Amino acid sequence: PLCTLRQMLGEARKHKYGVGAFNVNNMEQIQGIMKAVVQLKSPVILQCSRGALKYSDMIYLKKLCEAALEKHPDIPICIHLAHGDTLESVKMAIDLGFSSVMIDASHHPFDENVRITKEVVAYAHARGVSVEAELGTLGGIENTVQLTEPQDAKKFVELTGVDALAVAIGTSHGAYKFKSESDIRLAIDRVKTISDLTGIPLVMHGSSSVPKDVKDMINKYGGKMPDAVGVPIESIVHAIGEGVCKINVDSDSRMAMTGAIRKVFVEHPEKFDPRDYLGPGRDAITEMLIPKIKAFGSAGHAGDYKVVSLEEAKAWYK
Amino acid sequence: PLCTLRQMLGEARKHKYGVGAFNVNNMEQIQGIMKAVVQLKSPVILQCSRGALKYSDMIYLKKLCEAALEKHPDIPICIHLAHGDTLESVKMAIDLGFSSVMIDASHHPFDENVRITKEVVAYAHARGVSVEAELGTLGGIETVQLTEPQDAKKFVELTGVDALAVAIGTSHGAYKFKSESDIRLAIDRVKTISDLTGIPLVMHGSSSVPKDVKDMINKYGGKMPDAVGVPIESIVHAIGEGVCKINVDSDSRMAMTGAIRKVFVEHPEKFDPRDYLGPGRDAITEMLIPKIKAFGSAGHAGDYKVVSLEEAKAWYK
Numbered sequence: 001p002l003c004t005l006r007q008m009l010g011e012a013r014k015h016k017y018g019v020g021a022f023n024v025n026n027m028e029q030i031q032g033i034m035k036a037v038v039q040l041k042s043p044v045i046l047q048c049s050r051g052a053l054k055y056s057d058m059i060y061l062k063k064l065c066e067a068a069l070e071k072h073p074d075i076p077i078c079i080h081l082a083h084g085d086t087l088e089s090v091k092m093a094i095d096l097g098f099s100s101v102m103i104d105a106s107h108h109p110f111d112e113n114v115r116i117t118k119e120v121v122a123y124a125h126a127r128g129v130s131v132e133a134e135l136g137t138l139g140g141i142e143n144t145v146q147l148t149e150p151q152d153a154k155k156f157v158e159l160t161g162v163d164a165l166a167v168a169i170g171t172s173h174g175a176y177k178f179k180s181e182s183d184i185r186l187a188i189d190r191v192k193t194i195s196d197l198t199g200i201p202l203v204m205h206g207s208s209s210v211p212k213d214v215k216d217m218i219n220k221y222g223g224k225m226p227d228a229v230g231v232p233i234e235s236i237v238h239a240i241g242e243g244v245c246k247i248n249v250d251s252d253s254r255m256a257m258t259g260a261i262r263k264v265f266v267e268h269p270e271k272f273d274p275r276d277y278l279g280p281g282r283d284a285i286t287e288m289l290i291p292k293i294k295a296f297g298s299a300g301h302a303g304d305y306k307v308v309s310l311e312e313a314k315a316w317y318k
Numbered sequence: 319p320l321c322t323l324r325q326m327l328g329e330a331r332k333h334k335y336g337v338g339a340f341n342v343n344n345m346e347q348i349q350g351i352m353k354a355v356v357q358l359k360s361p362v363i364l365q366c367s368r369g370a371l372k373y374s375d376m377i378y379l380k381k382l383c384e385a386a387l388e389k390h391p392d393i394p395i396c397i398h399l400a401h402g403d404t405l406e407s408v409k410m411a412i413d414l415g416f417s418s419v420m421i422d423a424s425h426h427p428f429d430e431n432v433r434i435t436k437e438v439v440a441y442a443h444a445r446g447v448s449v450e451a452e453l454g455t456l457g458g459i460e461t462v463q464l465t466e467p468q469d470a471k472k473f474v475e476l477t478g479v480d481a482l483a484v485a486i487g488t489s490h491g492a493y494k495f496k497s498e499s500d501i502r503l504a505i506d507r508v509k510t511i512s513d514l515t516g517i518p519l520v521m522h523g524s525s526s527v528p529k530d531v532k533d534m535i536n537k538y539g540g541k542m543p544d545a546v547g548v549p550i551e552s553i554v555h556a557i558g559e560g561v562c563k564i565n566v567d568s569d570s571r572m573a574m575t576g577a578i579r580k581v582f583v584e585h586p587e588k589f590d591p592r593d594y595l596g597p598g599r600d601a602i603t604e605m606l607i608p609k610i611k612a613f614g615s616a617g618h619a620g621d622y623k624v625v626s627l628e629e630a631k632a633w634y635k
């Protein structure tokens with residue numbers, strides 16, 4: 001059933017596992033993601049960006065998530081606004097039925113980040129909805145990136161009461177996160193300190209790994225992504241063990257679908273039925289995701305708890 | 319709103335136009351079709367084959383169609399089972415909430431076709447759901463059984479179906495005739511079947527395989543050099559003689575495929591599915607606009623108040 005981010009990640013903090021949060025834009029993506037979490041009996045977070053909602057005129061995406069919730073009632077499923085920037089985007093998402101939202105005001109100074117985030121927490125928690133916020137900015141270390149200062153994270157959470165905190169540790173969006181695989185620099189040592197000082201679930205953004213087979217397929221069949229590099233899965237597993245409970249992954253699913261289509265285009269150029277290539281694209285998403293979900297550690301946990309509904313969740317904040 | 323095939327094609331027969339029936343399989347395909355019919359204020363039929371329902375684990379396509387019905391409350395939209403073979407398949411589309419079903423028993427001798435079809439008509443009509451059947455078999459003229467108009471009249475009298483698919487030389491796929499220079503159809507009989515039966519007629523296998531769409535696929539790595547469709551002028555003529563529903567699937571498949579192949583070649587560094595499926599969706603829309611304009615349904619979406627499935631039950635009691 002629909003599940004809050006607070007309960008879902010609370011459970012991952014407790015057992016020291018992490019839950020992948022996968023952005024969705026259409027039917028095949030959601031199916032690719034659900035087949036993997038179902039096969040592994042794992043909880044899941046489906047997140048929707050403003051770009052996704054625009055792409056699907058909103059109602060179509062809302063309906064697709066309904067289908068998922070209905071087809072697999074036994075899977076704790078969190079529907080999350082991936083990256084809202086105002087209170088307005090939050091009311092909109094909550095109206096569509098989401099159980100969680102992210103409010104990102106990290107590019108503002110501390111007190112303004114606190115203020116904007118506090119407004120959202122009041123509105124969301126009044127309806128039982130979870131809130132994720134961010135302190136610090138994304139970008140690679142190798143000047144202007146602002147990594148999370150643990151002592152300030154402690155203060156931020158105390159002042160806002162967010163349910164989860166996105167941390168800045170050297171990751172960034174996209175398929176080109178580091179200049180090479182031989183020199184990957186992350187600031188994961190502080191995760192444990194942030195987790196202990198805040199006492200709450202942490203979130204990592206820009207965390208696709210850019211798996212070898214997915215990249216090789218794209219470049220083998222006419223794609224041009226020779227220098228792609230993502231976050232090593234070992235690093236993510238280390239951060240998970242230190243308190244990271246939610247890992248945002250999008251690029252990996254993007255590449256897996258693109259590589260799959262590119263291969264069908266080359267091996268069978270006479271085929272023109274979209275199911276002929278979107279099918280293998282959906283499945284390549286499932287196959288790429290299975291070893292990832294196991295490493296995150298959420299496999300087997302879908303049946304660990306009884307899902308609290310949004311209505312009952314209101315009591316946590318009163 | 320959700321509309322029955324009986325009413326939608328009834329309005330088309332009366333005003334001498336045809337309504338496109340487009341097969342859907344996922345979100346982008348439904349969006350591209352909807353944008354075209356919404357832009358042209360045209361009624362529309364979205365049809366789902368058994369393959370589509372398997373491709374989409376059924377529930378996802380049901381929900382997407384609901385999204386279309388809710389987003390555009392003013393467009394009469396018929397949700398039809400594209401090609402059921404058994405009463406079992408019809409029952410499953412009805413349980414998903416479809417407003418129309420096709421039961422094709424055309425490969426069976428006349429009597430058995432009639433028997434199988436009647437059983438589906440009894441079940442469907444008790445819910446107000448429309449039924450399309452077929453007399454004659456698909457396939458080109460150059461074993462194919464073209465529709466015998468006098469038999470078509472008896473078949474319709476005996477079954478009570480709301481629409482009849484006719485066999486006049488069309489066939490499914492992108493290689494309908496050996497060359498564009500030798501295209502032979504049996505359109506002469508459409509008018510006769512129309513008058514003899516008194517009901518809306520349906521054309522299957524009627525994608526036109528438009529040149530631009532064909533050129534794009536072959537320009538960017540595709541391999542469909544000999545593809546050929548039904549000329550649009552031939553469909554326009556059949557519509558004026560009684561054809562009210564025209565099934566089109568290959569054209570949208572090709573329009574989406576050519577668009578993705580072009581982005582792949584022009585921006586080989588792009589890997590976000592929205593970057594190519596977006597253009598794939600718009601290609602479908604642009605390819606469909608001139609097609610819907612020629613079918614004649616533009617501007618008719620507001621001609622009638624839509625009778626719901628519940629009220630429709632009265633038509634058959």
Ligand SMILES: O=C(COP(=O)(O)O)[C@@H](O)[C@H](O)[C@H](O)COP(=O)(O)O
Pocket residue numbers: 023049050051052082083172173174175204205206207208209248249250251252
């Ligand atoms: O961190 C994320 C994924 O990063 P990634 O490149 O997969 O390592 C997500 O939360 C992003 O915010 C998301 O992928 C952005 O999607 P759009 O805004 O382009 O739709």
Ligand SMILES: O=C(COP(=O)(O)O)[C@@H](O)[C@H](O)[C@H](O)COP(=O)(O)O
Pocket residue numbers: 341367368369370400401489490491492521522523524525526565566567568569
């Ligand atoms: O007549 C039709 C379209 O023909 P076409 O090749 O587009 O001229 C449809 O009714 C077909 O039945 C439909 O395209 C079949 O779809 P699937 O069974 O492959 O899903």
Ligand SMILES: [Zn+2]
Pocket residue numbers: 082083205248
């Ligand atoms: Zn994000």
Ligand SMILES: [Zn+2]
Pocket residue numbers: 400401522565
């Ligand atoms: Zn058909």
